Amino acid sequence: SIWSRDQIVRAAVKVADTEGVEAASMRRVAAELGAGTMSLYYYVPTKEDLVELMVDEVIGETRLPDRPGPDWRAALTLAANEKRALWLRHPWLATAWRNGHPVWGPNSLRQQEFVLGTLGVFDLQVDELLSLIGLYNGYVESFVRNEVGWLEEARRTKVDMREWMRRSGPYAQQLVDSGEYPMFARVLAETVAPHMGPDQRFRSGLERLLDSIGASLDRLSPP
Amino acid sequence: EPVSIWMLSRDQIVRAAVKVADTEGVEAASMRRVAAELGAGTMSLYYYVPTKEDLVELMVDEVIGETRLPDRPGPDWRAALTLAANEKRALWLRHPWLATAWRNGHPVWGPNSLRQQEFVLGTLGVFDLQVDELLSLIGLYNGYVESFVRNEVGWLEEARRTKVDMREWMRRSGPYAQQLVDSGEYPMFARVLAETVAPHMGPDQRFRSGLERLLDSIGASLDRLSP
Ligand SMILES: CC(=O)O[C@@H]1[C@@H](C)O[C@@H](c2ccc3c(c2O)[C@H](O)[C@]24O[C@@]2(C3=O)[C@@]2(O)C(=O)C=C(C)C[C@@]2(O)C[C@@H]4O)C[C@H]1OC(=O)/C=C/C=C/C=C/C=C/C(=O)Nc1c(O)c2ccc(O)c(Cl)c2oc1=O
Ligand SMILES: CC(=O)O[C@@H]1[C@@H](C)O[C@@H](c2ccc3c(c2O)[C@H](O)[C@]24O[C@@]2(C3=O)[C@@]2(O)C(=O)C=C(C)C[C@@]2(O)C[C@@H]4O)C[C@H]1OC(=O)/C=C/C=C/C=C/C=C/C(=O)Nc1c(O)c2ccc(O)c(Cl)c2oc1=O
Ligand SMILES: [Cl-]
Numbered sequence A: 001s002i003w004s005r006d007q008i009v010r011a012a013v014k015v016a017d018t019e020g021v022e023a024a025s026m027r028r029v030a031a032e033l034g035a036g037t038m039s040l041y042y043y044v045p046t047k048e049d050l051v052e053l054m055v056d057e058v059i060g061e062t063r064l065p066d067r068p069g070p071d072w073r074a075a076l077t078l079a080a081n082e083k084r085a086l087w088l089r090h091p092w093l094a095t096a097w098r099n100g101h102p103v104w105g106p107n108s109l110r111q112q113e114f115v116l117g118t119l120g121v122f123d124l125q126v127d128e129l130l131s132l133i134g135l136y137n138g139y140v141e142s143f144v145r146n147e148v149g150w151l152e153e154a155r156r157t158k159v160d161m162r163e164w165m166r167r168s169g170p171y172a173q174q175l176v177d178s179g180e181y182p183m184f185a186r187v188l189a190e191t192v193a194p195h196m197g198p199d200q201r202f203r204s205g206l207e208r209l210l211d212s213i214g215a216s217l218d219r220l221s222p223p
Numbered sequence B: 001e002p003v004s005i006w007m008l009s010r011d012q013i014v015r016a017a018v019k020v021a022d023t024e025g026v027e028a029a030s031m032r033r034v035a036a037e038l039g040a041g042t043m044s045l046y047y048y049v050p051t052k053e054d055l056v057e058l059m060v061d062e063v064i065g066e067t068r069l070p071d072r073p074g075p076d077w078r079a080a081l082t083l084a085a086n087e088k089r090a091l092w093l094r095h096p097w098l099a100t101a102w103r104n105g106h107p108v109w110g111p112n113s114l115r116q117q118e119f120v121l122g123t124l125g126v127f128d129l130q131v132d133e134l135l136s137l138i139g140l141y142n143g144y145v146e147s148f149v150r151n152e153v154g155w156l157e158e159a160r161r162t163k164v165d166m167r168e169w170m171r172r173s174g175p176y177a178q179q180l181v182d183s184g185e186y187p188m189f190a191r192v193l194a195e196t197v198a199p200h201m202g203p204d205q206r207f208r209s210g211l212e213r214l215l216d217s218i219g220a221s222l223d224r225l226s227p
């Protein structure tokens, strides 16, 4: 287990933020530091290891409270906004982890202590805790991975979410006119969210997610 | 102003891209490599398929046409979502690049994708829901399936590179997990390792068990919002 390297990781991060993670190849990160590649490899064997070290490294930028306190909705909300701002700042976090094994670096584990801690006081089987936290973490990640995706897409096409929605209007009408997608149509007729800006959309999605967690907790702990 | 891709034939270009991606991942199936395979030339394909992103979008909807969900909702929403989940996981396992290839913000609105979405969205259509609430609960369900299978594929890919699978990784990491518990700093990590069952089930049993807890949470929200 992979758990001064640190200065290597920081230069990697700087490159990945600007030019994407592919561009943070091992030759370049050397260039960035003013060293030749042969020493880099001593401290950081593989590019897979570096990505893992970068993940943990940037999570160290963030600081949550030492303990969540009893308001699990306010604590998860704080964790949500921190995590979103970290992914927007380091968009490669949304697509870079390709492996199955979890990252057990100190900073990753510190933050999970806080997020798991929020529902840690409840008398739940731990796999139920992980299931509810899974719901919460899934919402934040799906949303922001999609957000990042729009930005990466815009830089190529010059068409962002709002502009894509307008230009897709005619195709959408064709699909409605097909008559084969009555639920898609009811979504297009009735949804409010896509017309909210990003910050308000995220927050209102988070409140719905939090209410679903809440409703589960009332089930397992009436009333 | 480009028109949607959805607005020598297309179907043979796509089926040919799918074969190179199945066997050798989505990178090994470019326009160059797809031309080669068909017995045709680099620029003739750009008539049918302008961009590689356009090509991937067609590849996704093509393979989604291998799954056939029912025409109609059914009152048992738990069974419905379970069927959808099992069918999505089998697909993704047959086409692992499904888990990673979609990197854009815009949704794939091919016909096979939307045919499948009618069934998934129709499952809670029974209920008195504002549409954004429906979408929120479907989001919880889809995120479960998607994280699960994408992690499952991650392990398969990691293991080809390392020759160390999920079980061998848990085994090999015991000493370090034990150092981490001994530090005293990670009490929730310790509890998880001491009490979790899931990662000791096989994948199929673990998939189903997590699904069941998810469905119970959907049920608790439906009861509150729509008695
Ligand atoms: C995330 C996302 O897609 O955001 C979209 C956004 C980018 O665009 C939004 C949008 C576009 C265009 C317009 C609109 C939009 O909101 C204006 O609402 C609008 O319709 C517009 C208009 O043009 C107008 O102007 C227009 O021009 C045309 C029409 C007809 C209406 C309008 O005049 C007026 C109206 O205001 C719709 C909006 O659509 C959605 O939010 C869709 C979300 C639904 C999620 C469904 C997921 C379902 C899960 C699911 O299927 N699970 C899966 C499985 O279990 C599964 C299992 C097996 C398997 O094989 C598969 Cl493939 C599976 O696939 C799965 O996905
Ligand atoms: C997905 C995953 O990690 O699966 C793991 C699997 C691969 O390995 C499992 C495992 C490993 C080792 C062992 C075990 C396992 O089950 C044997 O159970 C075992 O413990 C093992 C042993 O070695 C033994 O043998 C052993 O050898 C050593 C010890 C100490 C115990 C044992 O003798 C007893 C037993 O046999 C644990 C298992 O761990 C989990 O499932 C944990 C899941 C929890 C995820 C929670 C995520 C949290 C979300 C979250 O943080 N959200 C986020 C934020 O809001 C967030 C916000 C801001 C921000 O900056 C960040 Cl970074 C953020 O990051 C976020 O992630
Ligand atoms: Cl990147």
Ligand SMILES: [Cl-]
Pocket: A046, A047, A048
């Ligand atoms: Cl590597």
Ligand SMILES: [Cl-]
Pocket: A150, A151, A154, A160, A161, A162
């Ligand atoms: Cl955007």
Ligand SMILES: [Cl-]
Pocket: B030, B031, B032, B052
């Ligand atoms: Cl290409």
Ligand SMILES: [Cl-]
Pocket: B025, B026, B027, B096, B097, B100
């Ligand atoms: Cl792939």
Ligand SMILES: [Cl-]
Pocket: B155, B156, B159, B165, B166, B167
């Ligand atoms: Cl495995």
